[PDB]
């Protein structure tokens, strides 16, 4: 149970990181 909870959090972290990068990437294109 706890393991899988952490897994979800891990994915969230990854998603969050990607989000910033993605936004930053578009900034490099448009900022």
């Amino acid at each position: 149970e706890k393991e899988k909870k952490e897994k979800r959090a891990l994915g969230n972290w990854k998603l969050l990181a990607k989000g910033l990068l993605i936004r930053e990437r578009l900034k490099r294109r448009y900022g």
Partner: protein
């Protein structure tokens, strides 16, 4: 594709400790060779990489293994630099830590609808020293064990 010109730098670094042309260099000189190309490893990391390079106890590495190790170190260095830049993106106030406020601000700016309870759960789950937040080293570790990057 790893590099084109930096490979020659690795060749020069290998040849610095291989003036006799024996084809191999001492593993104990691994620390200096990394410092010749700009790397600054720590004692624990040096011991861990010497253990992996010298599993058979030969004490010498050939050109291919040295080149592979240097490429891996360069990849890890650029990954760490990108992770540090991401940390700075999180740490907009330059406090050195990704506190609850920083994570909440990043989540709100990105448009995520993650609950504050989930934010503090993730902070605690990635909190190792128990300081109440995530530090540079904790963020680096959590990125290391992430799904991918």
């Amino acid at each position: 594709e790893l590099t084109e010109e930096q490979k020659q730098e690795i060749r020069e670094a290998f040849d610095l400790f291989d003036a006799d042309g024996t084809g191999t260099i001492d593993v104990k000189e691994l620390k200096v060779a990394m410092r010749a190309l700009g790397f600054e490893p720590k004692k624990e990391e040096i011991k861990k990489m010497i253990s992996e390079i010298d599993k058979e106890g030969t004490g010498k590495m050939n050109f291919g293994d040295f080149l592979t190790v240097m490429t891996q170190k360069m990849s890890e260095k650029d990954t760490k630099e990108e992770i540090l830049k991401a940390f700075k993106l999180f740490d907009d106030d330059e406090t050195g830590k990704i506190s609850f406020k920083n994570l909440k601000r990043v989540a709100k700016e990105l448009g995520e609808n993650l609950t504050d309870e989930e934010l503090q759960e993730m902070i605690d789950e990635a909190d190792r020293d128990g300081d109440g937040e995530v530090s540079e080293q904790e963020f680096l570790r959590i990125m290391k064990k992430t799904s991918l990057y």
